[PDB]
Write a protein that binds this ligand. Sequence first.
Ligand SMILES: Cc1cc2c3c(c1C)C(C)(C)CC=[N+]3c1c([nH]c(=O)[nH]c1=O)N2C[C@H](O)[C@H](O)[C@H](O)COP(=O)(O)O
Ligand SMILES: Cc1cc2c3c(c1C)C(C)(C)CC=[N+]3c1c([nH]c(=O)[nH]c1=O)N2C[C@H](O)[C@H](O)[C@H](O)COP(=O)(O)O
Ligand SMILES: [K+]
Ligand SMILES: [K+]
Ligand SMILES: [K+]
Ligand SMILES: [K+]
Ligand SMILES: [Mn+2]
Ligand SMILES: [Mn+2]
Lengths: 501, 501
Amino acid sequence: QPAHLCFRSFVEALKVDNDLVEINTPIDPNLEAAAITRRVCETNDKAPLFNNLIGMKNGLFRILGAPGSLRKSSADRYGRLARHLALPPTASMREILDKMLSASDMPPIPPTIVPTGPCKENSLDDSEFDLTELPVPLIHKSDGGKYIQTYGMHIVQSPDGTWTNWSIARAMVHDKNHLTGLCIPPQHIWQIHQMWKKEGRSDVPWALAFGVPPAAIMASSMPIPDGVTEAGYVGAMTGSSLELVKCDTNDLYVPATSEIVLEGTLSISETGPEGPFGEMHGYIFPGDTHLGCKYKVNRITYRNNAIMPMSSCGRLTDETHTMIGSLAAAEIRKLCQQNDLPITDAFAPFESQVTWVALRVDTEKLRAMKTTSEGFRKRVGDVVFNHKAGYTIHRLVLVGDDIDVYEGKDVLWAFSTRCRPGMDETLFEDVRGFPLIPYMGHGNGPAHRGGKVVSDALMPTEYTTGRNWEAADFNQSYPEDLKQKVLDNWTKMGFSNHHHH
Amino acid sequence: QPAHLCFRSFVEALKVDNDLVEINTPIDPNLEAAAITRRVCETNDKAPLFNNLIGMKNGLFRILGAPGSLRKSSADRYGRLARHLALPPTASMREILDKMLSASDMPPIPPTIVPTGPCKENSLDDSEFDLTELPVPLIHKSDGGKYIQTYGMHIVQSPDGTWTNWSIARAMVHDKNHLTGLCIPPQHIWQIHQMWKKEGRSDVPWALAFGVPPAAIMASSMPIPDGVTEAGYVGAMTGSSLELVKCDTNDLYVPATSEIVLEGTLSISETGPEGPFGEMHGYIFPGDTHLGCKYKVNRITYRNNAIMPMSSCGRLTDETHTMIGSLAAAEIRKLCQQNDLPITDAFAPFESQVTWVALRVDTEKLRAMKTTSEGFRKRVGDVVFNHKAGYTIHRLVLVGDDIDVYEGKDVLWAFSTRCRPGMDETLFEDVRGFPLIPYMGHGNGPAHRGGKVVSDALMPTEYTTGRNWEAADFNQSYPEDLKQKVLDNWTKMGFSNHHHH
Ligand SMILES: Cc1cc2c3c(c1C)C(C)(C)CC=[N+]3c1c([nH]c(=O)[nH]c1=O)N2C[C@H](O)[C@H](O)[C@H](O)COP(=O)(O)O
Ligand SMILES: Cc1cc2c3c(c1C)C(C)(C)CC=[N+]3c1c([nH]c(=O)[nH]c1=O)N2C[C@H](O)[C@H](O)[C@H](O)COP(=O)(O)O
Ligand SMILES: [K+]
Ligand SMILES: [K+]
Ligand SMILES: [K+]
Ligand SMILES: [K+]
Ligand SMILES: [Mn+2]
Ligand SMILES: [Mn+2]
């Protein structure tokens, strides 16, 4: 099966790419696996596959860390993401995000039900598993639990059956047969959980599938629209109907090649202690436990030699940056275009801890709008910050056509030099805020509201008659023939120089 | 003579460091020398010494580009700056700025007058030079003149003789015997020029010395206090009285080993066209010429085989970033401490195009002040933005003790995650602004006023009871013994690793 459609195949692809380190000696799931993974992420090293995890019982489980993190080279920086999607490993961020948006103007391709698959190779009923006995990792030293769930997808369906959502939300072990996790607005797990709570008749049928098709985990991490079943979007994006099998204890459907599947219920009535957790913005607040949503596990099914993917998230760079940020930026780009805003490209700079999105503006189109900074800033922020796609993003930076928004240096340059603090910005205090950002949930103001800004790094003539500067750089401040002469004579003269490396 | 006290010796030091490329074939001062230099600066390459400059007449002149730019290695990144100051090439930014501040609590060491020096080896009177015939560089393709003056020091004295100022301000050739340049408030060349204008009796005696003692050009680039003679501050910093010779046509004194000296007057009545110029923030605005101060040149004296230093300034990284930013940050650090503010360190992040300064706070001292963010932000901004040392700086970022302000990544992390936009900031509209920043002089508001902000990236408990998080990083989220085990086993397990490279 192809790498994008089968996690086991994806692991093989990373090996074959020389982008894997198999660690066959014993590694402790208490901090050691996550520490190695953390180091990998901070240094853009090869992904670690822990084949010998202390306490692995009954085939449960190996760990793959850093599944969606960066490679060291610039040439294949995003290769691990490209391998989720059947793209060449040299794919640009623009190409990856276009691939992720491609299904937005295609008919869904609904999934195909098959009678069995590898995820049924082994099973454990309620009397045969204990989640506290599994080699669940402690990811950060002050975490409030063992976070089994950092890179699986929760599967829940609307009561009426019309919408089946796949998403990543964290979860930790509560006891032998329960998890706790985050289910917060405006996320689709929360929106569906609300529907069940209002019907008030039963707990929500649930499954959590780990080691799912890489193309499915990418969609799981993307804020595609309300009511849209991720399976059918992935089907359209890949051009292939995904093969699903039914759960044994409920009527939900899981990817046939899932490494590990939990089946059970998400309670409409019960909560339990959840967190703290080392989070995407790079912090943990010791002792900061709150009540989260509570899941009961009734059944585990799993592949022979099952592999649990894990995100050791925190400071740059991991899945929380490469996937949360970039895929929100992708959705935002589309949302802006669908609202008739002249946005060509969007990216969440890593340097902003993916709390910013830079929006590249088609300034020819802007000029034709005959508008002003104050008006345009307000329009853009109203579109984005009133929508779920804008949830995680606290600052939008508008930049003209000369800026490559996928290059953080250039975004920082434009922001720092073209946006006058205060005057060129509009603050938004009556929008939903992202509480996980420290300055929100642990800050001076409301955890859940405001703290958002549109920063306009368009220069004044970009609204009127056109750019009226040239950069003071090698590219723009010297004619072509001279630049080429300099480059041609560079090593001859005695200076230093390869793209791949 | 030592490298820090003699420019010729400094050039030798760079050679011997393997930090120089001597280019002995013909190079055009029309753009080619500056293009090579620009490429050097954008790639942190070796400094170029142009020994064969097309149009060099009567020993005038060779060019050294990138005299204060960065080296490629992290280990000696700042080595070219260290070589200005007699510091080891491995010196940290903290060590360089402490060296630059060391004279602030020392008695000046006044200069020593000597009867002659190398700068008297050759002379040209009014009938014998023509500044339009010299190989003055065109630094950027759209510059409004040939900028002879990018790395020399202007020398002017108060009418009463009590203060002799050395500073860098740009100047370009106007005609055979005049320059035009920038003389803008609150800079000391402007402040002294004002004194002469109010006395109204004569033009200002002036000299411009190129290829001065490297320690003197560093002080020339630093906003040491009003009324303080830079020569005596350099003397104290270096522990050595600087040797000066008298000009031939006026009673000012120039460094004995100056490569090239112009003697003349700065007019109290006349102006001429000046600019545009490719500037420190990375822009030029074609055709944007304004009236600037006008200098008359009466005499040139120069060393045999004179070398003109040149800054090909613009986008990162050159003298305008490494020297303007860092030395303003140094002065700001001291200014804050002298105002009883608990600031340990200051640096202007390159990523901000040196428009920000990050201020590291001693949070133990902050806690004892029993204050709030709104109060502390206002206090800091009033101190800094009402002072000349704060002129070029539009955003101050306050950070706690865990942040290394000399590391831009860490500043960006703190800013992005700990400062809530709007609520955690104070805007300052009634302070002097820096017009050269595009969003000021070419922006939506007053070119010369406002557009400044204090952004508080201290978290709330840093004011009260102490930091209440741990980072979600390898350093802080794993115990010491585990971290060391991981590092010790790193290459054994199969991952990738040298400090010098
Ligand atoms: C890649 C990724 C995405 C996480 C995530 C992580 C990763 C690795 C973790 C597990 C390591 C850390 C926490 N995560 C959470 C999360 N969203 C959320 O609501 N709660 C979370 O706990 N997200 C983001 C979430 O997946 C996106 O916002 C989706 O758009 C949600 O899908 P939906 O649009 O269908 O609701
Ligand atoms: C290192 C450096 C500093 C320049 C400078 C440049 C460099 C290379 C140039 C020449 C390449 C580009 C323009 N420069 C100007 C400048 N200050 C100013 O008022 N006008 C200028 O044109 N500065 C900054 C100035 O030197 C500092 O603000 C000093 O503090 C001024 O000294 P003062 O405190 O004695 O006035
Ligand atoms: K999703
Ligand atoms: K602007
Ligand atoms: K000075
Ligand atoms: K703050
Ligand atoms: Mn969804
Ligand atoms: Mn001065």
